[PDB]
Structure formats: structure tokens, C-alpha cells
Amino acid sequence: YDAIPGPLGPQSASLEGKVALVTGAGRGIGREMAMELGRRGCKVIVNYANSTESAEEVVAAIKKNGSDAACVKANVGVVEDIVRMFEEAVKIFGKLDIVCSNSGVVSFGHVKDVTPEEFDRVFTINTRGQFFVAREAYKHLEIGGRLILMGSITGQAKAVPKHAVYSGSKGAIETFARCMAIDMADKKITVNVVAPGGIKTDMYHAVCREYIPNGENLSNEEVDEYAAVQWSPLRRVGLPIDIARVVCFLASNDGGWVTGKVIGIDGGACM
Amino acid sequence: YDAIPGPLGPQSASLEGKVALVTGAGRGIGREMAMELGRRGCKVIVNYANSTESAEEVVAAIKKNGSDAACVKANVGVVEDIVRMFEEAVKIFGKLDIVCSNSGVVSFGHVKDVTPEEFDRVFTINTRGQFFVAREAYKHLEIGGRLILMGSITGQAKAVPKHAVYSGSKGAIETFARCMAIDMADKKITVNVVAPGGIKTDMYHAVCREYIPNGENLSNEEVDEYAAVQWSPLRRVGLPIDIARVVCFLASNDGGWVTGKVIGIDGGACM
Amino acid sequence: SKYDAIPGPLGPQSASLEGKVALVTGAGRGIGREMAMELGRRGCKVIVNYANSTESAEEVVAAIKKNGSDAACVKANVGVVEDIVRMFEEAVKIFGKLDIVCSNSGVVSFGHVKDVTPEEFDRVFTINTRGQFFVAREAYKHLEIGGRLILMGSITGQAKAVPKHAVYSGSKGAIETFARCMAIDMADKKITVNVVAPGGIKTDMYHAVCREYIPNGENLSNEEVDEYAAVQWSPLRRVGLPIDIARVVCFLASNDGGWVTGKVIGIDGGACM
Amino acid sequence: SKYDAIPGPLGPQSASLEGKVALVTGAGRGIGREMAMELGRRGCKVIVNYANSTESAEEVVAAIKKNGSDAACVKANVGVVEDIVRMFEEAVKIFGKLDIVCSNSGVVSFGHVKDVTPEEFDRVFTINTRGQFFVAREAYKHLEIGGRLILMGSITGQAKAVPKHAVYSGSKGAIETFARCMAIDMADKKITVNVVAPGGIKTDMYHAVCREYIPNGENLSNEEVDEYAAVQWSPLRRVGLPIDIARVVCFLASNDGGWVTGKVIGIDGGACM
């Protein structure tokens, strides 16, 4: 029990020669996860559901930076797509070391107005989808593998109104991490959840003002000032790279004793 | 802002003349919630899905104790049943002051073995069902009403293996409480979640040993000793009345400033 | 099967504090004063502790008697452990036993971390943390088997947006950990230990430092401060009052609070701070 | 748009601690010793603080130099604020500036709440809580703009099953609250403040009190204690080691930890205590 796990020194942070799969990697946070993982030495499998051209673009940019990459189409709202995506994936590079469950959709609405169709729309992707991506990940990962789930500050937030559906779908993920950390440990796989605050993406551009009291008439410039001054003492807006960096840490040997945890990445936000 | 809300003294705990609806009140914890609420002066609407005779029995026992009661059939896994149950309910006693979302099912299994049918079975009732019971509750409750959701120690537990599905369905409820507490406050309604530890019910009798390492061969007598010594410094097993009492507190004026909270009722358990 | 025994009475009698004996530290003013009053109204005999407010303490005692219960005050400063030990010895001499102990006494503090002096750090921790811990030690020793111990915390123990508040916030955060740890030990005498964590509550403490929690609030009128507190800190849209806390303390002190131990109960109207 | 600027370098250089200067309190032994060593291997110049272990401190310094970085030890007891102030003044004189501060120094304690003396309560809080707070005050004043401050917490701050541990547990729990509150203040200099909360880790502290966390463990052999720790406290089935913590400290100290502030990072292998 005194044997050192992995190398001492800077090498413990290396992702050289690893093979990673990221869901929803054609845009936003997922895209940056794939890019950054590629820069650190990973062969990356870029999953997408709709954005086909964007996906082929991420694959090209990763090769340009010195790492191999490939894309695979699959909709997480369909367990069968998830099952085959993983079967294709292991055929591409021969193994799977890291899995980043990133795909997700957003939603806003007073509880009194939520329809069962909208509730199901969100949960099938944000919760049920991540669960099944995790199931297949367990079966296919190398012993000593990694699984990083995507949460949100909304799982614990206390002041965002009309956001129960989305918030609840993300809150469930924090519990999965703890419970899956136990089961998946029989394969020495760690499981954690990243919980970012607002990050500038297409998602952010579409609903940012929903998190801002009386912000319907704010200019894009004003929205970012609010985000910078209101959601962080460090006084700046969050960016995809802010998350990609933490994902890489968890994915490396440096995160070997971190499992069953929820890592908040929001610049000290209070929401 | 200095005006005292409600009466000073012991009367602030009274549930006299209130009308409450409890889902899954024909058995277990729900049954005790209805009984106790009835003893404190509430007219109770006993919902059930399958247990018809048990339901009529709870209604009779409540009348016997001095309060009116009535039963209504509805399956929470069907939004339409929930919609009509509430419409019937307000016709029975003329109004609705307290709603206890209690109905739930249990499930155990290693992540690698979970099927989409089982995952959906559990979430449709424990999560989607509670969400829609809450939606209808909001629409029908009196201003100053109450809504108590049913969680579990499993939402935060860290040592129960093969329990991700159930645990996650309950963990989502803690997030709903915070988010719904905001929306429902426009009607001065409070929303909280009760998170019990093991409580002796039919549920407990069926899966208690799943929470006990190497407990497959334990006698019922031995299971209770383990539960008493292992899950509580107070050295006893949890009982439905332990939960019913806290529900009554939240339902009264005494709980007027308690909203958006998760109240753990497990006798100081560590699971 | 012995495990099937119902603990306490079924029905509304489970909420009763009739004939109980309770001690409240710092009961001459604020939240502590209202705890004693409300506990008094539910039928408890109350020992009103105070460190400085002598005349106010005597007034609380007289008011409780007028409401139909018996009370008496005892002077003690929680900064001196010896004062606490003798306070409990005098307590049991007055009413014969002790059923409920409410550790309420506390002081507030604001200041950028760079400006905190060791004297100010010690000023606060000795009362808010060290004081509560020793009041808890004595409460254990003297409480009836099946008694109650409620510690005073704050929203600041978990708050994320209050600047220049590490000393006070840290002194309260430690209490949440004392509850979980003390709930284990004190259970050998069937005593339950919980922490109440209020949001802002209108007392003397609030009037002195409320604006410190409000960004650019230095020039706000009292009327504007309450509006901010009411609208910003609660979806229910109102300010917190001593009775909001007193009511939850009574629940915890009753048989209704029997299975609730080692917990933190936030009572802030759904605040986000 | 100024908000679109990427903070720091893309790729693996973001994980670099090359040419950084770090100070670690209690770096002559245990977790503190391994933090200094590992930080040294990633390219930092290290100031090795110690209060008593002089010879051990000198050994850590020599080992870091042998691994290719520069180091120096400074004697200081965190119980004396004046020793901390002068320690930081001597620190900047040695390497010219300070980029990373690791508040690691601490003592353990066990005892039923009924048996705790005020002298023992003060012994622990002065080092574990008051000490860390004043090491943090000085770290703020002397740190480079964009620096780092990592406080040492423990699993005990939130643990639910360790009996006779309210003093120590409470002293660590307060740190989690210091992180959230100090992250706000120290951000005016772009410094991030986080808390690492380890589970059991094999050090001298562990060897002295490990059995106290194990029910009926008083007669366990060291071999049996490790097996219990490995199987009971982790699904991964192994014991915690100083390197497991040192690695996470380095992450937080790097540009990779830039958006992580005001957080508690548990590093216990998925333990439940």
C-alpha cells in the first residue's frame, strides 16, 4: 500500500498516447475538450448528432495540431446509437482511455408551464443520455480509465427562477458520480462531474439573459460585463478552455485519487 | 416587515382545519403521513394506484380518529391521472392546503446491467411523477400552501453500491426543491424535501439486505440490529412516525421560513 | 420487535414542551430573547442567561412569568469556561434539571482578510466557536437522558458572495461540523444535536451591520435596507424575524425532532448569499 | 471581446510550474514534505517551513536541490503571528517573490466532548484554524498578482461517523468556509483560494491515530490497519499517500487551476466516513 501510483514529477500530468471520446464535440465546450485533449497528446473521437461539417472541422484541426482524430455520429437520446458509437469507436483506434460525457440541451420555464414533452426532451438527453453513455463507457474503458460527466452550477444554484427542469437534470448527475464511482472502481476507473458556471458558447448566447434579472434588453456587450462583474470576483467571463483544462487534469494520473467528486469551475460564482 | 407571521405560542404548530393530499397513502410512510396529519386536525385525501382495499382502510381509520378522509385513484406515471386526481380532490373538500408527494419505487443493480426499461420505470415515478404532482399542486394550492417532496439519504450517500438509478432519481428532488421554492413563492407556498434514512415498511422488508455488506443470509431480527447499531448513534430503527412528525412541522406555520431546504431524517446515519 | 415500539405519543402531543426546562445563552436580547419567550409560551421553565444586559434579562424573566411559566436569569460570559460550568450548576439548582439547551450567544465582525488583527480574530472565535463548544460540553454533562442541544450557526457558513467576512463566517461554519461530531458522542445519553442557520433576522446585530452585506449600501435608509433584504434575500419577499427561528427551535426541542440529529437546518426564506 | 482573450497558454504548458516560487508550511515531514518535493520536481523554487523538525527540514531542502531546483528552510511556529510575518519577510528576501502558498501545518486530536479541556481545544485551534488564517493573511500581502493559496482541510470537516473528534473536525471545517470567503477578498489581486480535503494518508499523523477511526481497532496490527483503510475507505481498494495530495496541489497551483476558486476538493479515493 506504499507503492507509488504512477510517475513522480511533471510526467504525471501527461495525456500522451491516450485515446479519448467526447460527446457533442463538434461545438462549444465539447469542441474545446477535444482540441485541448489533442494538444496534450490524445487521439480524439469526436461524436456529434447534427453538426456534421463542424465535426469534420474539429477532426481536421486536431490532426493539424499533431494528433489523430475521427468523428462518429450518434444521438444520445437513443440507447442503440450509443451502443454502436462505442463499438465503432474501439475499432477506430483500438481502445478507449478517457470518456467525456458532454452533450446537453438547455431549457427555461415556470414550473406551472412545463409540459411532459419538454420535460422528457431535456431528461432523455441531459440525464438518461449521460447515464447510458456512462454504461457503455464502463464496458469499453481500459482498466484505470476515466469518465467525466457534465453537470452545472444549476444543480446547487439558489437564485435562478424558472429553471427546475434543466437544473434537476444536472443535479441528478452529481448523485450519479458518487454512485457510479463505487461500481466502476472494480475496473479502477474514476468518475467525476465538472460543474461549470456560465461559459461563452452557443448555449450561452441563446439563454444568457434568462439568468439576468431584467436583462431582456441587454446588449451582448452588457451581458458579458454583468457575467464578469456579477458571477466572479476575478472579474471576467468563463470560457471553454477554463473547463477543458480541468477535464485534462482529471483525465491524467494527477487525478488518480479524485473520484466520486463534483468539481465546480465557475470563478467563485454565487448563483 | 416587522409584522408577526401567524400566532405566537403553541397554536403555530396546529394543523386544525387544513386539507391535505398524500400520494401513495395506502401503505408505508404515506399511510403514516395521512394518519398523523389526520390526528392533528387535517381532512385527508388518500391517493393510491393499486392498493384499493388498504386505501379504504386508511380512510376509515382516519374518520375513526376524528377527521374526514377520502381516497382517489391515480398513477403518477401518467400525467393525465395526476391532472384529474387534483380536480377530483378539490371537489371533495373544496380546497387544498398541503400536498405530500410520497409515491415511489426502489431499484438495485450494477450500472453495467441497467436496462432502459428499468431506468425509465424508476424515473417516471420517482422523478417525473413527483415533478408533475408538484406542477398540479402549485395550480391548486391555497396561497400560503405547502408542498413536501420525498427524497432519500441515497441522494447524498457514498457507500451504497449498485444504486445509481434509484439514488439519482432521488438526488434530482433536492434540486427541484431549491428551484421550485423560487417559482412557487409567488403563491407564498413553501417547498421542501424530506430525506429519510431506512424506515421499516414493505420497501424496507424487500431490499434492506441490499444495503448491508454480506447481508443476504441475515434474519429479519439481525437486519434490524444492524440497522439500529450501524445506521444510528441513537441505536434504534427508523419508523414511519419519525417522518410523519417532521412532515407535520413543515406543513404548519412553524415551518414558514423553511423553504428550498432538504431535511435529513435518519437518526444521524452515515451511508 | 422492540424496534417496533413507537417513540413518544401519536398525534399533536408530540409537539408539546409542557413542563420542560430550558436554558438559553444570551437570552436578554434578540433571537435568544425570542427563543426563551416562545419556549416559555409552549410551557417550558426558562433560565435566561446574559453577560451584560442585566436589566433586559430581568425583563425577559418577568415577561415569561406573566405568560404563565417560571423563569430566572443567570449571569455568565461564554469567554470564561469557569463561568459556564457554574452557570449550569446554578441552573440545575433553580429548576432541578435541564431538558433543552439553546446555545445562542454570538458577536459579528467585518474586515478584509489583510486587515484582520489577532486580537479581533480571537475576540470572535472565543465567543462564537470556543464558547459554544464549552456550553455544549456542560450541556451534555447536565442534560436529562433524551434531552436536546441546538447550536447557533448562520447562512454565512456556506455563503458565497459576502466579502470581508472570513472570521465570522468561519466561526459559524465550524459549528455545522460540531453538530455532526457532537451528535455521535451525545447520543450515548439519547440527546440530539442540531444547528439552526438563520439568514438575516431583524435584531440589534442586524441594525449594526446589515449594510455590510449590501453592495454600495452605505447610504441606504433603514426603510431601503429592509426592502433590499425582503426582495433580494427571499422569493417570499419579506424580512426574517426572531419568531421565524424560535418556532424551528421549539420543533427540534420537541419529540417531533426525535429522528433529526446531526443536521443543519437553514431558516432564511430561501435566500441565496 | 476583451473577455474573449484566452487566459494563459493553450496545450500542456498550462500545467507548468517552471520558474515559480512556492512556500509550504510544515514541509519537513509528511504531506507538507511531499508537496515541496513534487512542486520542486515541476520546477518551483521552494521555501521549506518547519517549527521543530530542523534536521528533517534541512534534508528536504538538500533533496530538492539534488532534483534540480533551489530551496531553503525557514523556522516558524504558526501559533505566533509574529513568526509568520517574519517568515514571509525572510521568504521574499531569499527568492525575490512568492507565487504559490501551501498552508499545510496541523495537529490531530481525539476525545469525547465531555472530556475536552480548554487547553486542548486551544492547542488545536491555534495551529489548525488561527494559524492557517494568519498564514493566509500574509500570503495575500506578499503574493504575486495572479498567485495561488491552497489551504489544508480534511474529510472530517464533513464526516458523519467518526466519534470523539469534534475539536479537530471543527478546526478543519472552518477552513472550507475560509476558502469561500477568502476567495472573494484575495481576488482583487487575482489570487485563487481553494481547500484540499484528504481522506486518510500514510504519514506520522496517520500512524499515531489511525486506529481511532476504526471501531474496535485498538488491537489491529499495522498490516491490518492498512487493509481496513484500503478496503473500507475506498472502492479503489488502496491506502492514500502524500503524492496523491501533492499532485492535486500542483494542478491548483498551475494555470490549469485558473477558474477553480472558492472550492473544496476532496481527495480520499471515494471514501465514506
Ligand SMILES: NC(=O)C1=CN([C@@H]2O[C@H](COP(=O)(O)OP(=O)(O)OC[C@H]3O[C@@H](n4cnc5c(N)ncnc54)[C@H](OP(=O)(O)O)[C@@H]3O)[C@@H](O)[C@H]2O)C=CC1
Ligand atoms: N455553456 C454554459 O453556460 C454551460 C454548459 N453546460 C453543459 O455543458 C455541455 C455543453 O454546453 P455548450 O457547449 O454550451 O452547448 P451547445 O448548445 O453549444 O451544444 C453542446 C453540444 O451538445 C450536443 N448535443 C445536443 N444534443 C445531442 C444529442 N441528442 N446527442 C448527442 N449530442 C448532442 C451538440 O451537438 P449537435 O450540434 O450535433 O447537436 C453540441 O455538440 C452541456 O451538457 C451543457 O448543459 C454546463 C454549464 C454551463
Ligand SMILES: NC(=O)C1=CN([C@@H]2O[C@H](COP(=O)(O)OP(=O)(O)OC[C@H]3O[C@@H](n4cnc5c(N)ncnc54)[C@H](OP(=O)(O)O)[C@@H]3O)[C@@H](O)[C@H]2O)C=CC1
Ligand atoms: N422505506 C424506506 O426505507 C425509504 C423510503 N423512501 C421513499 O418514501 C416513499 C414511500 O416509501 P415506502 O412507504 O417504504 O414504500 P412502499 O414500497 O411501501 O410503497 C410506497 C407507496 O408508493 C406508492 N406507489 C407506487 N407506485 C405508484 C404509482 N405509480 N402511482 C402512485 N403511487 C404509487 C404505493 O402505492 P400502491 O400500493 O398503490 O402501489 C405506496 O403507497 C417512497 O418515495 C420511497 O422511495 C425514502 C427513503 C427511505
Ligand SMILES: NC(=O)C1=CN([C@@H]2O[C@H](COP(=O)(O)OP(=O)(O)OC[C@H]3O[C@@H](n4cnc5c(N)ncnc54)[C@H](OP(=O)(O)O)[C@@H]3O)[C@@H](O)[C@H]2O)C=CC1
Ligand atoms: N441577526 C442575524 O441576522 C443573525 C444572527 N445569528 C446568530 O444568532 C445569535 C444572536 O444574534 P442576535 O440576536 O442578532 O444578536 P445581538 O447582537 O442582538 O445579541 C446577541 C446576544 O449575544 C450575547 N452575548 C454576547 N457576548 C456574550 C458573552 N461573552 N457571553 C454570553 N453571552 C453573550 C448578548 O448578550 P449581552 O447583552 O449580555 O451581551 C446577546 O444576548 C448570534 O450567535 C448570531 O451570530 C445568525 C444568523 C443571523
Ligand SMILES: NC(=O)C1=CN([C@@H]2O[C@H](COP(=O)(O)OP(=O)(O)OC[C@H]3O[C@@H](n4cnc5c(N)ncnc54)[C@H](OP(=O)(O)O)[C@@H]3O)[C@@H](O)[C@H]2O)C=CC1
Ligand atoms: N495524515 C492524514 O491522514 C491527514 C492529514 N491532514 C492534514 O494535513 C496536514 C499534515 O498532515 P501530516 O503530514 O499527516 O502531519 P504530521 O503530523 O506528519 O506533520 C504535520 C506537520 O505539521 C507541522 N507543524 C506542527 N506544528 C506546527 C507549528 N506550530 N508551526 C508550524 N508547523 C507546524 C509539523 O512540523 P514540525 O516537525 O516542525 O513540528 C509537520 O511538518 C495537517 O494539517 C493535517 O491535519 C488532513 C487529512 C488527512
Ligand SMILES: O=C1C=Cc2c1cccc2[N+](=O)[O-]
Ligand atoms: O448551465 C448553464 C447553461 C447556461 C448558463 C448556465 C449557468 C450560468 C449561466 C449560463 N448562461 O448561459 O448564461
Ligand SMILES: O=C1C=Cc2c1cccc2[N+](=O)[O-]
Ligand atoms: O431510500 C431507501 C429505501 C430503502 C432504504 C433506503 C435507505 C436506507 C435503507 C433502506 N432500506 O430499505 O433498508
Ligand SMILES: O=C1C=Cc2c1cccc2[N+](=O)[O-]
Ligand atoms: O449572520 C448574520 C449576522 C447578521 C446578518 C447575517 C446574515 C445575513 C444578514 C445579516 N444582516 O445583519 O443583515
Ligand SMILES: O=C1C=Cc2c1cccc2[N+](=O)[O-]
Ligand atoms: O484527518 C485525518 C488525520 C488522520 C486521519 C484523518 C482522516 C482519516 C483517517 C486518518 N487516519 O489517521 O487514519
